[PDB]
Design a protein around this ligand. Structure first.
Ligand SMILES: C=C(C[C@H]1O[B-](O)(O)c2cc(OC3CNC3)ccc21)C(=O)O
Ligand SMILES: [Zn+2]
Ligand SMILES: [Zn+2]
Length: 231
């Protein structure tokens, strides 16, 4: 049964196992008078743990490393940040403090620094053009073009057909868009096209916020975006 925002006090972290060596991490934060849940990904790489995205905060993130060790017992050696907002790079300093080599594209690094956000240590090359992909450990990394933001990346685990969309992918119950001051709404469904074509087998699909689903979510997300747009 997946955790929900109301089960997670602010500053605490949960883990949810999706498939052998594949988990999502969940945390909750305040963003103007309300508290929201946020998702991330953890994939086993043998003796070591690959992190996708922070827990939204230097504090939540210290609590993410705690629950990983308690519940998994392995060491996080590399983390990838899917885009440049604070639910994705916030916590990257704690991470580096505690031993992690932290990676994100050069677009992400440059945008985080202009914004006033924390900055990943190492550049990810091979993701500068729509449809580019690169292997990185036990996952694949995919830049499908502009959408939620100009630099957003998704992450596929072939060993288990888990597809992680980040904030470019909405959950089923979300019926309005909300936050888009950095989206490319026009380009966004063309970018979901590329994801659908590129991973049409995916059994599991994880959104930046909320409840997991399947490829249904790609259609569901395409629809919400074209509604915002027609109004
Ligand atoms: C739930 C959300 C908001 C969530 O999406 B996001 O672009 O990853 C993000 C950034 C963010 O940064 C703050 C720190 N200063 C502005 C805060 C919240 C979000 C949604 O549905 O989109
Ligand atoms: Zn964002
Ligand atoms: Zn988000």
């Amino acid at each position: 049964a997946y955790p929900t925002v109301s089960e997670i006090p602010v500053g605490e972290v949960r883990l949810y196992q999706i498939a052998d060596g594949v988990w999502s991490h969940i945390a909750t934060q305040s963003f103007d008078g309300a508290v929201y849940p946020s998702n991330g990904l953890i994939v086993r790489d043998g003796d070591e743990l690959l992190l996708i995205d922070t827990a939204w905060g230097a504090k939540n993130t210290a609590a993410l490393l705690a629950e990983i060790e308690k519940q998994i017992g392995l060491p996080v050696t590399r983390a990838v940040s899917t885009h440049f907002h604070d639910d994705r790079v916030g916590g990257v300093d704690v991470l580096r403090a505690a031993g992690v080599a932290t990676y994100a594209s050069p677009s992400t690094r440059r945008l985080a620094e202009v914004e006033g956000n924390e900055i990943p240590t190492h550049s990810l090359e091979g993701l500068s053009s729509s449809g580019d992909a690169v292997r990185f450990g036990p996952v694949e990394l995919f830049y499908p073009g502009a959408a939620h933001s100009t630099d957003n990346l998704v992450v596929y685990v072939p060993s288990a057909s888990v597809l992680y969309g980040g904030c470019a992918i909405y959950e089923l119950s979300r019926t309005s868009a909300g936050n888009v001051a950095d989206a490319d709404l026009a380009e966004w469904p063309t970018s979901i096209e590329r994801i659908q074509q590129h991973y049409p087998e995916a059994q599991f699909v994880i959104p930046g916020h909320g409840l997991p689903g399947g490829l249904d979510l790609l259609k569901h997300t395409t629809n919400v975006v074209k509604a915002h747009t027609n109004a």
